[PDB]
């Protein structure tokens, strides 16, 4: 989904614009729209305050949301004078549903004053719009009056359309808030529509029956969903009952042909509001749809043992087996995770349907968040693929972002499903469009898998210098779907030793461009081939004191950022599982054993010629050191020899064949002064070394009596990297 720049819709301030959302696809034209319900909006109706609106928002390039005029009349008057009806503060637009060219908008809080007595009953009413017609459907406005009947039914609190266009209403208030489910065909509603009679009945309506007083205050119909669970092509009704089972909550599935109960799924914790929202869709790739139940107020025990309110979603897979198969829990307190659920369809087109879940108080600043959970074989993933949060700044009132959701429909026809998120706290709705997914993998290989430290058979171009250059190659291949153009564009970066952090010596270069790193722009035919290229590199001789470790060949690739967007106006995205980062180790061999891991060892000794020195004037001094090596050769060896403060180093003895040709550059950063001599070129196993260092002594007074030396030597490789300390002394005579 595109989070960087979604499309946002704004309604009148304070309207609750965004309380309900849905897609609209009429048959009269190819035009695409979005329906947003605004239950608190003021209307044109005479003598009605905050009657509610439903606003039509086209997907055109230049558009503003426009209210749908379902009903312009004010409240009906009874015989004589007083009003029959109370349309003020009816929540028209609290629920909005659509089925091709049909729209169902409901006002759960609509009241009416019956005949036979002065009452005020929130029966609730729905308006059903067709391509031409607009009809009223208020099945709970009946002759059964009062809370003992259907007076407080609030029909239309939750609604949905069956695939064959049946209207489904849930009224939580019928029969002392037992709740009720009511449904009719669009044909039945239109056939029996007589606007001049308030208590009209639909002759083939399906409704749940009144039950015992034991079941009061259950709120059956708080939320509804449709799916096939009996297996005969007629969608069944899924209804939430968040206060039943003595407040544990439960969800019923009713046969779509006769309203008889099929299955019950019960919450695990009282007051969790198990059933606040429900959804039905197959997620594990079978033919059979599965059930989702939200419990926004679920509490789970924290580390210290106290209960923490995070919310939870229950998943029931079907072939339906009573006990839930997997759960998703919120990670933040009072987030109300699971307040909304929406099937996304096959969001990533990988072959399994995905779900979207909302927490109207999750995220930073508690603005609310929507979590995308990808489906797959054996159900939903334990972790979300994406998080959506309101990008507008938080304010005093919550945005309630993610309160309402709808997906599984394609708006721009780019081939991927899109999503609608409503935030009625700011009077906004926001549109997220799915971007094309590009799945790719790469290759990285070297012909001389092991690099020789001294082969140097390869010459530089037009230059006398010869180096141990080697041949390397890399590959990249991609696949895509949707309207994704087949000419994909990638950028790949090659690096030889980028892991040499903290400014460590760069040690290798590419032959062309003579640089350690190189960036290559690439273009690939989607799924058309696997493409490879070759390169030449060489080490830069060998001015690096890092032969202890191999070269860290490295590469990374990303989609060509600056490429033009597609026709629909979006840029593709790499699949999350792709290995955008890849590396291999190139080993270095001088003579480091048949196993390529040599095991060095070091021996050393020290002596001095003029072991007696005078005081009061400059006197010469010399130090003699010898080293013996063990193992498969040695390199990087260094004389770490400390020297006193009262003498200065005046060079090694280069002018005798009996002594090794060392090179020295002494350092005096601290009182632990060092002579710092290199032992020269690499040497083979069993080699012996002898050297002599000259010094000048500048003792000023007889307070001192001797001078002392301490030394150490480095190893060939990581094993026994530095030798123990050895010491020597020189005496002062007088």
């Amino acid at each position: 989904l595109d989070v960087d720049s979604p499309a946002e819709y704004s309604g009148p301030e304070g309207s609750y614009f965004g309380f309900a959302v849905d897609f609209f696809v009429p048959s009269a034209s190819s035009r695409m729209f979005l329906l947003v319900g605004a239950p608190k909006a003021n209307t044109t109706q005479p003598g009605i305050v905050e009657g509610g609106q439903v606003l039509k928002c086209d997907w055109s390039s230049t558009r503003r949301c426009q209210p749908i005029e379902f009903d312009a009349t004010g409240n009906r008057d009874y015989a004589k004078d007083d009003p029959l009806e109370f349309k003020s503060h009816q929540w028209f637009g609290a629920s909005v549903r659509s089925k091709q060219d049909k729209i169902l908008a409901c006002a759960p809080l609509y009241h009416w004053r019956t005949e036979m007595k002065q009452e005020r009953e929130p029966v609730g009413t729905c308006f059903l719009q067709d391509g031409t017609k607009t009809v009223e459907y208020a099945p709970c406005r009946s002759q059964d009056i009062d809370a003992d009947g259907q007076g407080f039914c609030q029909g239309g609190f939750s609604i949905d359309f069956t695939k064959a266009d049946r209207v489904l209403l849930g009224g939580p208030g019928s029969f002392y808030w037992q709740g009720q489910l009511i449904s009719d065909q669009v044909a039945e509603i239109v056939s029996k529509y007589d606007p001049n009679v308030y208590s009209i009945k639909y002759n083939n309506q399906l409704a749940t029956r009144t039950a015992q007083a034991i079941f009061d205050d259950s709120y059956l119909g708080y939320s509804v969903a449709v799916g096939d669970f009996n297996g005969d092509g007629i969608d069944d009704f899924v209804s939430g009952v968040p206060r039943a089972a003595r407040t544990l909550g439960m969800v019923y599935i009713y046969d779509g042909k006769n309203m008889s109960s099929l299955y019950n799924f019960t919450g695990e914790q009282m007051a969790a509001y198990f059933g606040f929202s429900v959804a039905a869709t197959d997620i594990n790739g079978d033919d059979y749809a599965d059930v989702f139940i939200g419990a926004p107020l679920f509490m789970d025990r924290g580390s210290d043992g106290k209960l923490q309110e995070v919310g939870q979603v229950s998943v029931s897979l079907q072939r339906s087996g009573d006990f839930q198969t997997t759960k998703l829990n919120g990670f933040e307190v009072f987030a109300r995770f699971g307040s909304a659920i929406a099937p996304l369809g096959d969001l990533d087109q990988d072959g399994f349907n995905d779900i979207a879940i909302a927490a109207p108080y999750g995220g930073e600043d508690k603005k609310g968040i929507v979590y995308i959970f990808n489906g797959r074989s054996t159900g939903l993933n334990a972790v979300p693929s994406q998080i959506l949060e309101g990008q507008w700044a938080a304010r005093s009132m919550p945005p309630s972002f993610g309160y309402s959701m709808k997906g599984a429909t394609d708006i721009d026809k780019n081939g991927y499903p899109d999503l609608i998120v409503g935030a009625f706290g700011v009077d906004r709705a926001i549109l997220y469009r799915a971007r094309p997914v590009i799945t790719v993998n790469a290759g990285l290989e070297v012909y001389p898998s092991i690099l020789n430290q001294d082969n140097k058979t390869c010459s530089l171009p037009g230059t006398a210098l010869k180096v141990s250059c080697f041949n390397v190659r890399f590959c990249l291949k991609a696949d895509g779907k949707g309207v994704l153009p087949r000419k994909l564009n990638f950028q790949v970066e090659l690096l030889l030793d980028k892991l040499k952090q903290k400014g460590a010596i760069r040690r290798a270069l590419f032959l062309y461009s003579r640089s350690p790193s190189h960036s290559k722009n690439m273009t690939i035919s989607r799924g058309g081939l696997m493409q490879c290229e070759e390169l030449i590199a060489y080490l830069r001789e060998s001015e690096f004191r890092d032969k202890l470790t191999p070269i860290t060949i490295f590469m990374e690739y990303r989609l060509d950022y600056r490429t033009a967007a597609d026709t629909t106006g979006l840029q593709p995205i790499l699949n999350q599982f792709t290995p955008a980062n890849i590396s291999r180790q190139a080993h270095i061999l001088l003579d480091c054993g048949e196993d390529n891991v040599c095991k060095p060892k070091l021996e050393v000794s020290v002596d001095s010629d003029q072991k007696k020195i005078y005081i009061g004037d400059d006197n010469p001094l010399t130090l003699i050191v010898k080293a013996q090596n063990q193992g498969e050769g040695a390199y990087e060896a260094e004389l770490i020899v400390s020297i006193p403060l009262q003498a200065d180093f005046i060079g090694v003895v280069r002018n005798n064949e009996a002594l090794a040709r060392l090179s020295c550059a002494f350092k005096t950063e601290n009182q632990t002064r060092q002579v710092v001599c290199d032992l020269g070129n690499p040497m083979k196993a069993g080699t012996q070394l002898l050297a002599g260092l000259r010094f000048s002594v500048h003792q000023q007074s007889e307070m001192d009596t001797s001078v002392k030396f301490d030394l150490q030597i480095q190893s060939s490789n990581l094993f026994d990297k530095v030798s123990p300390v050895v010491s020597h002394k020189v005496d002062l005579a007088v």
Partner: protein
């Protein structure tokens, strides 16, 4: 080796005193020839210095007022005491140690707030809640003396689904359609603030009457939230243990129920009780969830108790398991079931020491002797004790230098026990022989023997006037 007192070549009792509090000076004229004047007291005694002629009487501390602590909190004929008072004497750079104990005699403070359901379904339970309220005040007074008790009432949100609004008469008389009379409905009203006048509580409780609404569940949890967070309106005492008793005979509304009435705003968990003592945000905020209630209850340290009828005891038992620390009792004619819970809360109801008016140059150290005679170094507090338990502490004191003031005092202060451990401090930084110029100890006189230096007059100089400027050549 030899001690500091002798090795420093002390010349006078003033310098001997200044060197260290452990040093002593012998003022006796009979001291043997050559013996040092400044030395440890045992060495002076070995040299036959008269004990009373030695300038070092050991530092000491002793009582000043030591009334024994009380054993019963009733205070039959005198004010109780729970701490006693001492005086201290010090040398320069001196230190001393001592100990003290405290006891919890007086009864713990307790606050009980009573929430009454006044729904019409409570009409036949009205006597039971009135009876229970009376015996809460009465029976608690036999456990603690300083009780504070108040009460409030709730019915439900006064909005369309719950409230009768159909005929204009129904607003004034919710029982109109039954052709009888009852009071107008209300969300939650605070009636009586926490007070010790139990007789006032009984009279106000017995004059309450039921209102009426439509749906069985009530808005009791709105009252629990407001009683918890409106501390200044309710009057919760910052130091008392807080008990909240909740009564009802029906199930309860919870968060997300307000959506039916058009209420979607979450409960803020803040005080919304005005001067009319009514919950003003009743019709605009949703009911609180169990998670939010548990947060505020723990934050305000309030122990909630449910006193509910049998038919809903299981429903609230499950709620209690999700609100840690709360308990449930059965509401009936016999109120003994719920009274036991109040007894239990009191049966499971702490001291720390402050220091005030400490001198500018005196310091302290503390250690604790907690329950079971366990000793903890550095601690100055003890927890977990009940009424009648006694705990003890030990204190070490030290000074640096010596002030010119002869006497000053400070005190230690336990939290809330009303008593003060006033300690008096005196300083004895002087020598007896120093009470009373032209001393023969100087070179042929010409000097005053004070502070260990003669301070010679004209024509002489040195520690003891041993030199003259004409002989004290610069070379």
């Amino acid at each position: 080796g030899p001690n500091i007192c002798t090795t420093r070549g002390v010349s006078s009792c003033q310098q001997c005193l200044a060197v260290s509090p452990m040093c002593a000076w012998c003022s006796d004229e009979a001291l043997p020839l050559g013996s040092p004047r400044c030395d440890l007291k045992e060495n002076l005694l070995k040299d036959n210095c008269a004990p009373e002629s030695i300038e070092f009487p050991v530092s000491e501390a002793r009582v000043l007022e030591d009334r024994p602590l009380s054993d019963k909190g009733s205070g039959d004929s005198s004010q109780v005491t729970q701490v006693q008072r001492i005086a201290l004497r010090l040398r320069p750079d001196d230190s001393k140690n001592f100990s003290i104990q405290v006891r919890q005699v007086e009864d713990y403070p307790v606050d009980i707030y009573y929430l009454m359901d006044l729904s019409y379904s409570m009409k036949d339970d009205l006597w039971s809640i009135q009876n229970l309220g009376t015996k809460l005040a009465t029976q608690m007074r036999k456990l603690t003396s300083n009780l504070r008790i108040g009460f409030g009432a709730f019915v439900d949100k006064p909005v369309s689904p719950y409230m009768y609004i159909s005929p204009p008469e129904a607003l004034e008389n919710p029982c109109y359609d039954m052709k009888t009379t009852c009071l107008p409905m209300f969300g939650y009203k605070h009636v009586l603030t926490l007070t010790d006048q139990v007789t006032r509580f009984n009279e106000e409780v017995k004059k309450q009457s039921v209102s009426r609404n439509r749906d069985a569940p009530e808005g009791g949890f709105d009252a629990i939230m407001q009683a918890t967070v409106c501390d200044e309106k309710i009057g919760w005492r910052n130091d008392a243990s807080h008990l909240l008793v909740f009564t009802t005979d029906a199930k309860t509304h919870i968060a997300l129920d307000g959506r039916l009435a058009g209420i979607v705003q979450p409960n803020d968990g803040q005080c919304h009780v005005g001067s009319d003592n009514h919950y003003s945000a009743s019709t605009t905020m949703d009911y609180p969830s169990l998670g939010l209630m548990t947060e505020k209850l723990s934050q305000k340290n309030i122990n909630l108790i449910f006193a509910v009828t049998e038919n809903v005891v299981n429903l609230y038992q499950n709620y209690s398991e999700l609100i840690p620390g709360t308990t449930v009792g059965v509401l009936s004619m016999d109120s003994s079931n719920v009274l036991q819970l109040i007894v239990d809360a009191y049966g499971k109801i702490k001291v720390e020491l402050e220091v005030r008016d400490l001198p500018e140059e005196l310091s302290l150290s503390f250690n604790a002797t907690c329950l079971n005679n366990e000793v903890i170094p550095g601690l100055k507090s003890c927890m977990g004790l009940k009424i009648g338990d006694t705990v003890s502490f030990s204190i070490e004191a030290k000074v640096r230098g010596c002030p010119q003031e002869k006497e000053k005092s400070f005190t230690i202060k336990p939290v809330g026990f009303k008593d003060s451990l006033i300690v008096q401090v005196t300083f004895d930084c002087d020598c007896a022989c120093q009470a009373q110029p032209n001393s023969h100890r100087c070179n042929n006189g010409n000097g005053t023997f004070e502070c260990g230096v003669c301070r010679c007059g004209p024509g002489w100089l040195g520690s003891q006037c041993e030199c003259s400027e004409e002989d004290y050549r610069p070379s």
